[PDB]
Each structure stands twice: as structure tokens, then as C-alpha cells.
Ligand binder design. Sequence first.
Ligand SMILES: O=P(O)(O)OC[C@@H]1O[C@H](COP(=O)(O)O)[C@@H](O)[C@@H]1O
Ligand SMILES: O=P(O)(O)OC[C@@H]1O[C@H](COP(=O)(O)O)[C@@H](O)[C@@H]1O
Ligand SMILES: O=P(O)(O)OC[C@@H]1O[C@H](COP(=O)(O)O)[C@@H](O)[C@@H]1O
Ligand SMILES: O=P(O)(O)OC[C@@H]1O[C@H](COP(=O)(O)O)[C@@H](O)[C@@H]1O
Ligand SMILES: [Zn+2]
Ligand SMILES: [Zn+2]
Ligand SMILES: [Zn+2]
Ligand SMILES: [Zn+2]
Ligand SMILES: [Zn+2]
Ligand SMILES: [Zn+2]
Ligand SMILES: [Zn+2]
Ligand SMILES: [Zn+2]
Lengths: 312, 314, 314, 312
Amino acid sequence: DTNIVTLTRFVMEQGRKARGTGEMTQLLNSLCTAVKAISTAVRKAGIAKLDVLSNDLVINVLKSSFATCVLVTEEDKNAIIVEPEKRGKYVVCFDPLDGSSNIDCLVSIGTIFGIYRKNSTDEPSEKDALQPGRNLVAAGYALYGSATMLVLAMVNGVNCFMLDPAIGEFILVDRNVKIKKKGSIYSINEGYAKEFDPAITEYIQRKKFPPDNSAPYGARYVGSMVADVHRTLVYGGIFMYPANKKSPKGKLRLLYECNPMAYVMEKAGGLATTGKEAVLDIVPTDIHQRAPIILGSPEDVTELLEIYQKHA
Amino acid sequence: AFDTNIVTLTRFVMEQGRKARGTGEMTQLLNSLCTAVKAISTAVRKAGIAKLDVLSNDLVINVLKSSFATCVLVTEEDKNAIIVEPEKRGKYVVCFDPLDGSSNIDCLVSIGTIFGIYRKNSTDEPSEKDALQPGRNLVAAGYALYGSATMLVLAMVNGVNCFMLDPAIGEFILVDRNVKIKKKGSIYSINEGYAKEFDPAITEYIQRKKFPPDNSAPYGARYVGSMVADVHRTLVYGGIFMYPANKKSPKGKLRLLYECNPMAYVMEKAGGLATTGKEAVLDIVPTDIHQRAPIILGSPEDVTELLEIYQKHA
Amino acid sequence: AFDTNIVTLTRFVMEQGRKARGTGEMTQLLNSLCTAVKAISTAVRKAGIAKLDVLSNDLVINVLKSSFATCVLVTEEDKNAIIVEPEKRGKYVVCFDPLDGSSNIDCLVSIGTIFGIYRKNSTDEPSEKDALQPGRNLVAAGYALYGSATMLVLAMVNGVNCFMLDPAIGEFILVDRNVKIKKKGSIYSINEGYAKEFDPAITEYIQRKKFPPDNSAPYGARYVGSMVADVHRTLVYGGIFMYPANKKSPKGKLRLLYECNPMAYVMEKAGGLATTGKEAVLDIVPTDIHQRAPIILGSPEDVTELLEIYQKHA
Amino acid sequence: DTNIVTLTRFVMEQGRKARGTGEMTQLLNSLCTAVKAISTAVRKAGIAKLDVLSNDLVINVLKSSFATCVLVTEEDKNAIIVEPEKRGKYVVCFDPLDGSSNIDCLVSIGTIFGIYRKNSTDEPSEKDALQPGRNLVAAGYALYGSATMLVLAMVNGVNCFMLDPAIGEFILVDRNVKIKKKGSIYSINEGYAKEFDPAITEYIQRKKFPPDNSAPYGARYVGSMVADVHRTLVYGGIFMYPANKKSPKGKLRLLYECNPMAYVMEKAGGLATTGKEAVLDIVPTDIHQRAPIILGSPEDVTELLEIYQKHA
Ligand SMILES: O=P(O)(O)OC[C@@H]1O[C@H](COP(=O)(O)O)[C@@H](O)[C@@H]1O
Ligand SMILES: O=P(O)(O)OC[C@@H]1O[C@H](COP(=O)(O)O)[C@@H](O)[C@@H]1O
Ligand SMILES: O=P(O)(O)OC[C@@H]1O[C@H](COP(=O)(O)O)[C@@H](O)[C@@H]1O
Ligand SMILES: O=P(O)(O)OC[C@@H]1O[C@H](COP(=O)(O)O)[C@@H](O)[C@@H]1O
Ligand SMILES: [Zn+2]
Ligand SMILES: [Zn+2]
Ligand SMILES: [Zn+2]
Ligand SMILES: [Zn+2]
Ligand SMILES: [Zn+2]
Ligand SMILES: [Zn+2]
Ligand SMILES: [Zn+2]
Ligand SMILES: [Zn+2]
């Protein structure tokens, strides 16, 4: 196509508008070089581990960006402070590879990240990451499945880019995504049904055998956060992964799994709560703390929310 | 990278066609299915920067024919079996759904091409009828998976072998020889949306996995909602994937012929007796080319634990 | 994009192996050469972000063998012809240089795999000797070109067909059927660095192209310096490509057997009598598996204009 | 490789050093999106024209760069003035596809370009392009052959990048290229031998039968500027395309064929002249004017230069 709208052309132009520096574009642009290289590596996984390559690659591409200064990773005890020569204004929390275990089974998997603006004057620190999900600038995810695709969420909107493998570029394909209001799918790992605190099980039964003599919802759980959420985004529905007994505080870590998806959901018009408060409104204390999460088409989450405040 | 000695499926299955003198008719056929399988996957990867199931079907028909190894073909998305227009004939019946879950692409869920292949027992004319051999007289079955990778798993009589498309050269090279599914698992796989309609044998089965009666580990659940997704996970890692029957689809949704069946041969040939509930899926003399028939498959002990309940409530 | 009906060389040549009952042994063989040809090209494209000729040879040997269509193989970069280690036997002699101009990569010039294939006239044992059939008893010859595209041109007995690697699916699909070279051209192609050593027949030939005696157009010159470059340009557009003999290489540089020869069959089968100067290159009973023999090829009239001078200075 | 040095990472960092804007990086980066897309299109040319796609694509990618303001093309009568909303400080003269005719024959072909800095205060104009080749900021070429490869020439050096097709990124492979001093190859279209003005023919014979009882040079002419020059660069040698009688002013247009290669040659330590003056020192009057050119390993060009001033 002689006028393809890459991610870079899309980013740079909204950047043109904030009358800023060009760092987000450097950051995003470098980030996508990690994504292509990981997409490529997941598509030949096992022609002869991974998540450590995956982590190295994204830390390196982000350091060279000349735009970060604290990078928080799934795979690292402590957060990373970018040499002064390479610092810039962003904090990126990311899980490089989420659900790495799944590659054997051939499950769709992904990278997830969120970018905070360091607003403070002192030395880069763990504290610059301990900012509420509400404050995020940009957040999104990279998905590796039949097609590699990037949903990027910024203050103006949610957009899906798709990697064209011929030209190694991400092309803008669906614009200004908004979710279906109520939907027909519930997603939860039902093997913990003996654990689902009584709000959930209610809604589970209430949807399977709908006592309103309605069509039951279908259920789906691919078991890789990213495919479950992407699906919830496009076809509408609800995904849930709440505080159960193996996992009393949810499983999904906050700064890099729960707050990006959340941010993406609300920008798209979905909601995402814990059933006790908003995922994005939490004030993190630990960079690696976890969350119960429930996100998806607003009425369904509103439905499960009635039940949470109709059971205490 | 840059390897001098790689077992490409053509080279692989050919080391099978000649040592056992089984003409390598298998080859030509398969080779062509590899060109279709690949071409479809390219398209699915650029999917939304460019139906499909239709064009996918037409391309599989069309390439198959020219492999000179067919006489009968059966699709999901087709009428009476196609009898090969006649010059390009040979001995096989390929029955297949080229794009399983053809909706699911747009939600970026993984989808596949299945195939069942038979050899012609009739020395009469190709008639749609010939398609209708039952399971256990199948020469080769497998699938292709358009996922994070394009994996074709082939199950012939000696065993199931998984394969993977190396995009850099366009070959399905080999990564798992004589695949054997595990003996017992931790996954039950079923669409529990339909929990009203579920026959009390499966409801017991679910209740024993979820809540184990003997106080142990709950079986974790997992249902992608693509038939080819759920079998592969269930194959390589091991589980009970169950699309039984229920009022909403009273004799299953899965068109036995090229779905429950091709899968099942891949299942049993690695340790997985795929049942209906009453009869095993391969012994069911095929009544119609799109005749449907319910299916619970997977690794041996999980099947069994349900068949006991099946045997105790009828 | 997304085409339901594409003539992949396997499908193509197979529509040739069965209508003429010529066992499709041709196929298996070729198909395997396609997997080598491709794999090498991937590597050349990432060349300098990763010898080669060696590994290229080993991979071509190794894939060939498993096509079950060989008994004798001859390389540039090899000793006595390899006799196939014996289980994988069949009827053909493939003689080939896998990486022609193997230096030229680093200057990013285009390079290729040639091949000559024969069928075994001996009902005795595979002996290196069997390799040694002359040109005119060749069953199929062609080359592959690692250029801006990977183009394999195949010349069998019915004609030359050019092919092109669609990287998106890994097939050499077809773009030029029954290729015929032009009758006369505007290109003379020779390494005039060596203008000292040039035998007075070629020096006349050059002087008639450069300066046309009859006051007309100077023949434009073009010499890539890769044998596979110079033939393709000379084939599709038409010219006289001449690596004659001279003191520095007294009976040519091009190892007749798998170079001047495989090219020449592709030449004559599209209108191009490739000569030595004295005998035509296909009639020369092959004295040794790397026996060299000079070559002037191309379209008919240009060859002729030189053979007259060849016929008038001896 | 978990720390690949892309072109962007290389550019951006030398840009870090001029304490500038980031526009060259935008320009180069956008330019490479044209190159990938053209490489891809040349590699499937004829599975069923081109240079018009090729031109459109590069003009569009350059307009969106937010860094040009005059773009001069092989395929356009008049130069192009970039809408004010999208102007920035660079002038890029480019031939998008050089030797397009050749694709049938399967010849290695390429894009060529040169980037001037508009120094003046008034409205962008044709005159901002009429600047001596000596003034160029950056220049280089993209080559499409067995591998697609970008040689980029900037004030600090000549570097070869190579496109990795897996990840769609250009990787820095040979650094700070310098040519061999004298070399063994002469390149000229000898079919014009009845036209070669007496300096050339001398040197032609002087090299073929070397009267110094020396080894003759080999000759090569692929007939696509770009493959000939790339080869001259790496293996050393000389390429020549002088004023002949069909073409009394050379054939190769100045601003986009002769001055980029020239610039690349000298930065690499080669020379390039007309045999009457330096190619880069010419003051163009026409944006589309042509040149006799002779460039390559210094001694060889010095050799042919003796002869030019030993024959008048
Ligand atoms: O390493 P990750 O990113 O946490 O990957 C596994 C994750 O953990 C979840 C699994 O949770 P359950 O098995 O408890 O449902 C998946 O959905 C997520 O991808
Ligand atoms: O619609 P197709 O192409 O036949 O494939 C979809 C299949 O049909 C099933 C849908 O059934 P539920 O969503 O009711 O479980 C999926 O599980 C299978 O993949
Ligand atoms: O060295 P190889 O691999 O045999 O291939 C190079 C060939 O050898 C010739 C070299 O001869 P000159 O450079 O002397 O013309 C080339 O024209 C041919 O491609
Ligand atoms: O359209 P372009 O860029 O000018 O392409 C043809 C060019 O013109 C030259 C041909 O000149 P001669 O045929 O006169 O040698 C080639 O080397 C160049 O690529
Ligand atoms: Zn993870
Ligand atoms: Zn995670
Ligand atoms: Zn289907
Ligand atoms: Zn189906
Ligand atoms: Zn060689
Ligand atoms: Zn050779
Ligand atoms: Zn041009
Ligand atoms: Zn030009």
C-alpha cells in the first residue's frame, strides 16, 4: 500500500500534538524491535530459556531508547535504573513473556507494559513506579498468535496495530476500539470452583443456567492472560481472576499485568475492578504486588458488582 | 542455522513410503496438503490487513486433486463428496474441514485444517458412498494448527509425529517423533456454559474433577473454543477434552466424519481412546458425509474414569 | 493474494510425470532439490549477519540422497562421483555446482546452484563411470538464481520454464512457460580483461559487435561475472555470452560436466546452440567428472555469426 | 541477538552527539520503511509499474517524516514542496529505482538519495537543492540483491547495514568502511568503445594488456549503477561512465546518482571526478543535470587522471 500508517507514524503524530520531545516515539519504536524479535522467536520455538532472552531483549532496547529511567520487570527482583547517559522521562513496567510455560501447548502468549512519566525531581527510584494505574500515559500489549498484534492504549484511544511480516512494520488496522456493552462470555479458571468466594459462584450459576430464562453465556479460558483479554476486548464479555485460596491476592501482579489491561479496558469503555475497588485506583506499595481482577463489558462487570455488594 | 541434514516431512514420510513399498502415493498427496496448509496460515497471519474458509476450501480441493492421489473428497463446507474430475485420479478419500472455527480469527484465537484419509476399497466407480468407510479402516489422519507457530501433527499407523513450519524455508520440519500422550492429567476441557443440558454422567465427571471426592487437587480447566486448540493442548500435555452431546446439539456438534474422527485416530494412535460415550468413535459405521457424533477424548485414564460413570447410569 | 489455483513446480512437473507415465521419479528428486535450493538462498540473504559452498554442497548431497531417485552424484567441490550409499537408490545421476561464484556473495553479486540430471544406462553397479554420459542424453537440466528474487529455471525436454520463489509460502511458482530465447541480440558478454589471450576469431567477433563493420548499433556489453548471472540475462533478453578458452585456462575454466553442460541443455532447449567453438557442447563425450570445456552460448544467430569466423581461421 | 544494533540505534546515537532535533532519525527511519517495502516488492516482481509505486512510497514516507521540505525525484519534472504542517529541515534528492528495466533480467538494482540541510531563511525552493555535493550531510544507497543492504554515509564514516528479514530491521554489519587503495577491476560499458574519448581507451588498453608486463585487470559491468558501485566499494577497483556521444554529458544525473555515490566514495577514501573536476565540487544549476563520473580506489582514478592531463 503506498500510504501505510505504521505505529511510528501514528505515535509521532499524536506526539506532534503534545508539543513534546519525541521520547515516547523512541520508546515505542524500540519496544516494537523487541516485539518483532520475540514474535519471530516464538514462531520457531522448538526447531532444534525464552523468557530470559525475552527480558534481556526488552531491557536493552529500552535502555537504548534514550527515554526511560526506571524499568520494572516480571523477571527481576529489583527495578532497573538506567545509566544517566541513557536516561529520559519514562517508567516502563513490563512482563516480557507472559505465560511462557504455554509454548509447548502452543497457546497464544504476550508481552505487557505500562508507561509512567516520572514527575519528581530526585534520583530515579522504585518509588517512581509506585504510582496508581490511573496515572498511566500509555499502556498496551503485544500478542503472539496467528498474527502478531499490538493493542496500544493512549489518552486519546485504544488502537490495534498488526505486524506485517513482509515489511516488519506494524500497521494500524482497527481504530478507536470501544467494547460491546454487555456480552455473552464469562472467563474464569473454573478448576478453583471450590474456592470462588460467594459473589463469583453466584454469578457463575446465574449465567450458566440463567434463572431469567435466558441464553446461558458460553465460557472460555485460554489460560494465558493476554488471549483471554484480547478476546474480551473484541467480542465483549468478561474475564475474571479473583482472590482464590492458592492465590488469596489474585495471581496477576499489579504494575505490569493488572494495570495495563485495566487502563486498556476503561479507555475502551470496559471497566475493571477487584469487586472491592478499581484496579487502576490502587496505590501500590510494592512494585510486584498482585490483584484480584475482573474486567470486561461494563454491564457484566456491573452485574458481578451488584452481587459483590449484595453478599456482605 | 544452516543445517545440512533436516527431516522435512516429505523426506520423513518418504523414508516411510519406500521401506514398506506403500507406493509413496501418501507423499504426493500430503506434500500438496502441505502447500495448502502453509498458504492458508500466511493469509491468517496477515488476516486483518488484506470468506477465508471458503477460499481455504477451494484451495485445499484444488491442490488435492492435482496430487494424483485422490478419487473422493469430503469438506465441512460442501455438498455430496466431490468425486475427482476424472483424469487426476488415484486411490484416496480425503475428508477434511479446512478452517475450523473460521470466526475465531477475528478474536485471534488459534484455528486449524483437519484431514482424514482413506484408501479406496471399491474397485467400482468413485461414488460418494466410498467416502463412507469407518474410523478403524483409516490410513492416515492429522491436523494443522495456525497458532503462535504452524504446527502440523501427522498420525499414521506407526505413531503421531508433530511438525513445525520453519518460515525461513517453507518446510514443516519434525520436533516430536512417536508421540504418546500422558497417562493421566490435570485438565478437563468442556464448554460449561451449557451446564443445564449436561447429561448426569458428565456432570458427575465434572464434579469429581472440580471438587475431587477423595480430597486432592482440583483439575484445572481450559477451553480455547477451537477444536484444534483443545485437542493439541490435550494431546501434548494431556487431558479430557469433552464436547459431549446435549439437547442443544442432540448427537454432538462435531461432524464425525472429518472432525471427531480424524482427531480420534491421532488420539488413539498416541494412547487416547476417543469415545462417544457409548461406542468408540472409530467403530461407528459412517451414516452420512457430514454425519455428526459426540466426542470425549484424551489420555487413557481420564476417558476411562468417565466411561465407568457412563456404564453406571444407562 | 490468496489464490486457489497455483502451479507450484511439484504440481507442474507432476502434471508432466503422470501424463507421460515417466514415473514422477523426476518429482521426488526435484522436490528435494527445491528444499536445498531454498534453504541456501535464505542463508545467502542473511549472509553477512550469521564456507557456505561447502555446507551448501553437503546439504544438496544429503537431501538428494533421500529423494530415492539417485545412484550417482557429481559436485564441483568433490572427488570421484558419490555413489549413493546404497539403500536410497534409484535411477539418476545428478551432477551439480551448488555455489557458483561462492566469493561473489561478499560483493553482493548474484550466484546460483546448477544441476544436470541423467538417468542410469547401466544395469551394472553404480560406478563413477556411469556419471560420464554426454550432453544430448540428458533427461533434465536447470539452475537456481539467488538474486533480487530466487528464480529456478528448469529445462526439460518440452521446454524451459522459469520459476520464482514466493517467500510467503515457500514454493517456486511459475512465471514463464515454454521459454524461447530471442533470435538475435544487442549484448556480447565476455571478460575482456583477458583481451591479450583472445583467439583471433573472438577478437574479430568483439570488433564486429563494438564497432559494427556495417555502420549500425554497437552491441552493448554486460558481464556480471557469475556464470548464472550472465546466462539468465543472456537467456531472457538474449545475447552472446562467451567464456572461450585462452592460455590462462587452455580448455576453458567451466567444468563442462555440471557447468557448461547443464546450462547448454537449458540453452539449446530454448533456441541456443551452445558451442565450444569447434564441437557443440552436448556431443562431447565426457572424459572426466570435472572435465572442463570452453563455452560460447546464447541465441542462435549470435552463436552462428561467431561459428562462421570459427570456420574461417582454423 | 539480544543487543542488535539497528540503523535507528546507530543514527539516533550519532544524532545524540550533534545536540539536535531527532529529524535525521525520523527521515532515515521513514526512509527504511520505503526500502523494506520495495525490497519485498522487488523479490516477488512478477508473481501474477514498479518505479511509480516506488516513487510514491518514498515521497509519502518522507512527507510524514516531519523532517523534509524539498524532495527531488528522478521520476518528477519539478521538485516537491512539503506542506508547512509537515516541513522540517532536510532536502532529499533520491532516485527511487534505479535501473528498473533490469528486473526482467534479475539484475541487482537500488534506491539512491542525498540529504541537504536547507540553510536559508526563505520559502522552500528548487534552489535549496542546487547545492554542491560537497555540502551533503548524509547520503547512501539501498541495494536489492541476494540480500537487501543499506550503505549510509555520514560525516563520521561509511557503514553497511543489512536487512534482517525475520525482524524487518537493518542491522549494522560492516563498520567504517575504507576502500582498497589500488584495485584489480575496471568497469565501463565497453559497447561505447568507439566513443571513449582518448583518455579512457588509453587506460582501457593500458590495463587489459598492461605494457608494464603486469596482470591485466578483470572487467565487470553489471549495468545497474548501484551493483557496480557497491562492488567498487568493497572489492576496490574503478567504475567509469563518462561523457560518450549518445550521452555527451554522462548519463547519470547529478543530484541523485552522481553526488551520493561520490560522497560515499570519498568518505570511504575513494575519489570521484569527471576527469576535469570533482563530482562533489560542481555547482549545479539544474536539479536534473548529468555527469560524467569515474570513481573508485584512489590510485586507479589517479591513474586515469594522469592520462586525462597527459592528453591535452
Ligand atoms: O508468567 P505469567 O505471565 O503469569 O503467565 C501465566 C499467567 O497466569 C495465568 C494462569 O492462571 P491460572 O492457571 O491460575 O488460571 C495465565 O492466564 C497468565 O498468562
Ligand atoms: O465453527 P467450526 O468452524 O465448526 O469450528 C468451531 C468448533 O465449534 C465449537 C464451538 O462450540 P461451543 O462454542 O458451543 O463450545 C468449537 O469448540 C470448535 O472449534
Ligand atoms: O568460482 P566459481 O564458483 O566456479 O564461479 C565463478 C565462475 O568463474 C568465472 C570467473 O571468471 P573471470 O572472472 O575470469 O571472468 C565467473 O564468470 C563464473 O561465475
Ligand atoms: O533509471 P536508472 O537509474 O538510470 O537505471 C539505469 C542506469 O543507467 C545505466 C545504464 O547505462 P549504459 O547502459 O549506458 O551503460 C545503469 O548502470 C544505471 O542503473
Ligand atoms: Zn511471565
Ligand atoms: Zn505475568
Ligand atoms: Zn469450519
Ligand atoms: Zn467444523
Ligand atoms: Zn563453485
Ligand atoms: Zn564453478
Ligand atoms: Zn531510475
Ligand atoms: Zn537514476
